[PDB]
Design a protein around this ligand. Structure first.
Ligand code: CDL
Ligand code: CDL
Lengths: 455, 57
């Protein structure tokens, strides 16, 4: 993985030594070169993972997450250069450096062979994200960080150090072969919660989800793209690595949290039918889609893991495109109110076509990989219990509705009279929409690369 | 016929030839504990570095 980390770090002199007008073009060009380089991670085999060194390895789970992570950086640089054109040049380079450092943390979070190195990179990703949201966010306690680190990261730290002292190693490749059955006790119960709850908050879990529809609203566009596209999937990646050690206790301890997700994807979806903020609607949709990833990881069948990694990749693409569409409207009406600007197909036909495609992939229109992930998760949960299909299907009613209501509220009807600064679609914005949607459509032609270690 | 000793004579360390044996353990000291073993052998490098969670050197 050293052939990807070193160009990522050479993007730091490539963004600081460049000229005063060249720090978007150079960074976009060379990050697209690294994203083209990222396809060599697809050297995968049906038995053995692509094990590079003692520190780095990349199986078919981390590989689509890595390709999406290295693809997300040029798209964030295309997204965030408009509203930073009035920003200072040194703070502009600071923003690009925070994005490059966050990519640097992510690409060796996903390829950490050893679990405490995964933990350090996992909790190192939060610092550039928090700098981006607090500094280049728009509006104005802080108790969410404290409640996160009490129930989350340090129980995970003590848990991984305990596994280190018991097993002798936190190598995932060794723990594939030295995994022991974890019996019913109270020590193993709090051990299981200490291993799981940090990723539970990072998904988010329903009831622990309220940090996200505010962190998306207080973010810039690149912060929202990297939150909903990659950083929410660190929880799913960590769960798919940590549920190896946590058997067979999960077979009776997944019962509460699955409830919180199986009802949660009912509630938050319905919350998406009662939103006034477009960006909060996309945020609660992200919660409702990650609930199925939580369910599919906790029931731990092969069809569920295939559906969950397909849903992670497809939801990263779809939610990033929806946040970029919300950015394109926020950079015209200067207000995130969804009922404010209406009828925008009468003015911007191609942008309304991108809205149509994004809403079709949001409600899992087949043969998209959204529907492939959604469908495989529904198959595995029907195998889990034959009643959950109702709770699936009711969800698949509501996930249509707010996907099209958001399409009907903003893009249809009579246009707003007192808004006359609706410019035509810039070429950068439609380029951003097409670089979100055309990979998402092309993966429908060959989905087996985004179906995880056990296709 | 006794000569009085001079200045310096009575404070001399003399030698005495006794027929009695030397006391081989005048302190009645019991057997000492055997000491801890010393180090021997050449110093090879550490097997795969520090072995501190993931650091390979
Ligand atoms: C690897 C090689 C691959 C080669 C083949 C390519 C494979 C497909 C790639 C994507 C194709 C569509 C891209 C254009 C649409 C988006 C932009 C747009 O609106 O353009 C309109 C525009 C023409 O309209 P316009 O009047 O000028 O302006 C628009 C209007 O203002 C107002 O707009 P509008 O509302 O009038 O028009 C929008 C209309 C609106 O219509 C709809 O929204 C209805 C669509 C849904 C219902 C019907 C389909 C249901 C599913 C069945 C079909 C799939 C399976 C079929 C197989 C049999 C059954 C299994 O949609 C379309 O016309 C699009 C038709 C194709 C839709 C593809 C699926 C999208 C649906 C949602 C996801 C579904 C799952 C994924 C399926 C993926 C399949 C590959 O078209 C173009 O300019 C096309 C430019 C070139 C596009 C290249 C695309 C490929 C890019 C990849 C590059 C790298 C690989 C090289 C391949 C190069 C191939 C040339
Ligand atoms: C004829 C006689 C002479 C022949 C000459 C032949 C050679 C010619 C080339 C001469 C030049 C050599 C240059 C270094 C050699 C390569 C070292 C390397 O990559 O090790 C792989 C090492 C492990 O990979 P591997 O495949 O197992 O080992 C391959 C070799 O066997 C590597 O050997 P190893 O397995 O024995 O490695 C030992 C161990 C292997 O590592 C481990 O066991 C894992 C522990 C790694 C540290 C984890 C810390 C996590 C928490 C803190 C996070 C820190 C902040 C993150 C970054 C903040 C912003 C900088 O390393 C360490 O414990 C040292 C810590 C990492 C430093 C590596 C070298 C850095 C030099 C440049 C520093 C620039 C900033 C780098 C970013 C700082 C953080 C890495 O990779 C990493 O640890 C990942 C990060 C990448 C390392 C940096 C790349 C080095 C070159 C950078 C040039 C570009 C700079 C751009 C400007 C600054 C941008 C900010």
């Amino acid at each position: 993985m050293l052939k990807y980390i070193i160009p990522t770090m050479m993007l730091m002199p490539l963004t600081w030594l460049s000229k005063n007008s060249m720090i978007w073009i150079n960074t976009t060009l060379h990050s697209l070169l690294i994203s083209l380089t990222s396809l060599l991670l697809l050297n995968q085999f049906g038995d053995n993972s692509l094990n590079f060194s003692l520190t780095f390895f990349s199986d078919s789970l981390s590989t689509p997450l890595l390709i999406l992570t290295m693809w997300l950086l040029p798209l964030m640089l295309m997204a965030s250069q408009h509203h930073l054109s009035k920003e200072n040049l040194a703070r502009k380079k600071l923003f690009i450096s925070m994005l490059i450092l966050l990519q640097l943390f992510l690409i060796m979070t996903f390829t950490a062979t050893e679990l405490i190195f995964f933990y350090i990179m996992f909790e190192a990703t939060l610092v550039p994200t928090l700098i981006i949201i607090t500094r280049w966010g728009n509006q104005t306690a802080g108790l969410y960080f404290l409640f996160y680190t009490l129930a989350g990261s340090l129980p995970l730290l003590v848990a991984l150090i305990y596994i280190q002292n018991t097993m002798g190693s936190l190598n995932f490749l060794i723990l594939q072969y030295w995994v022991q059955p974890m019996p019913n006790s109270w020590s193993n119960t709090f051990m299981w919660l200490a291993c799981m709850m940090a990723f539970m908050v990072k998904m988010p879990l329903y009831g622990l989800h309220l940090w996200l529809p505010k962190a998306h609203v207080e973010a810039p566009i690149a912060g929202s793209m990297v939150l909903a596209a990659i950083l929410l999937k660190l929880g799913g990646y960590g769960m798919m690595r940590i549920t190896l050690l946590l058997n067979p206790i999960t077979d009776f301890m997944a019962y509460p949290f699955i409830m919180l997700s199986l009802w949660g994807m009912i509630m938050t979806s319905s919350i998406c039918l009662r939103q006034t903020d477009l960006k909060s609607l996309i945020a609660y949709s992200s919660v409702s889609h990650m609930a199925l990833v939580i369910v599919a990881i906790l029931i731990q069948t092969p069809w569920s893991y295939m559906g969950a990694t397909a849903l992670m990749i497809a939801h990263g693409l779809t939610s990033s495109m929806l946040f970029c569409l919300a950015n394109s409207n926020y950079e015209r009406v200067h207000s995130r109110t969804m009922i404010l600007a209406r009828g925008l197909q009468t003015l911007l036909p191609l942008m309304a076509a991108w809205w149509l495609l994004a809403s079709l992939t949001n409600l899992a229109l087949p043969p998209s990989i959204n529907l492939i992930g959604e469908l495989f998760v529904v198959m595995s949960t029907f195998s889990w219990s034959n009643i959950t299909i109702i709770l699936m299907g009711l969800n698949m009613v509501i996930t249509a509705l707010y996907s099209l209501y958001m399409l009907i509220t903003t893009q249809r009807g009579k246009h707003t009279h007192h808004i006359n600064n609706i410019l035509p679609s810039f070429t950068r914005e439609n380029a951003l929409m097409s670089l979100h949607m055309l990979p998402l459509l092309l993966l429908s032609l060959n989905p087996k690369i985004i179906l995880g270690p056990l296709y | 016929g006794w000569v009085r000793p001079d200045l310096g004579e009575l404070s001399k360390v003399t030698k005495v030839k006794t027929d009695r044996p030397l006391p081989e353990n005048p302190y009645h000291s019991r057997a000492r504990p055997e000491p801890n073993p010393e180090v021997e052998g050449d110093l090879k490098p550490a097997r795969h570095g520090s072995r501190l969670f993931f650091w390979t050197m």
